[PDB]
Amino acid sequence: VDVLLGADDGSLAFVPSEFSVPAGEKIVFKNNAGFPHNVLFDEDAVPSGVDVSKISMSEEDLLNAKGETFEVALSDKGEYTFYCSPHQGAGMVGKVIVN
Ligand SMILES: [Cu+]
Incomplete structure (x- = not known):
């Protein structure tokens, strides 16, 4: 799966931010x-x-x-929160569920 760093519109987001x-x-x-x-x-x-x-x-x-x-x-099942270091305080964080 691909996850983009930064939206095309300049938003500080992972895309997708949960998957x-x-x-x-x-x-x-x-x-x-x-x-x-x-x-x-x-x-x-x-x-x-x-x-x-x-x-x-x-x-x-x-x-x-x-x-x-x-x-x-990621091999271990469960929830993982990832974040961007520059932008963590701006809400650039996300969650992957490994199943
Ligand atoms: Cu970032």
């Missing part, structure tokens, strides 16, 4: 517009047992050009 994927499906976060963006998972809002450092970008790494990607496959 479900079967365990193991590769999620491709694709830098779209109004960057910089990046993608991290929230240690306080993932399934028990998940280590968010293995599935997040480094906080200092920013995608600054359209078409860059960050790709991850």
Whole structure:
């Protein structure tokens, strides 16, 4: 599944911001517009047992050009909250349900 970073209209959003994927499906976060963006998972809002450092970008790494990607496959079932570091305080966050 592809998830865009930034809406075409400049909105600070993941697109889609909530979605479900079967365990193991590769999620491709694709830098779209109004960057910089990046993608991290929230240690306080993932399934028990998940280590968010293995599935997040480094906080200092920013995608600054359209078409860059960050790709991850989530294997543990449950809810995961991801966020963009620059824009987390502007509501650029989302939720994937791995089933
Ligand atoms: Cu962002």
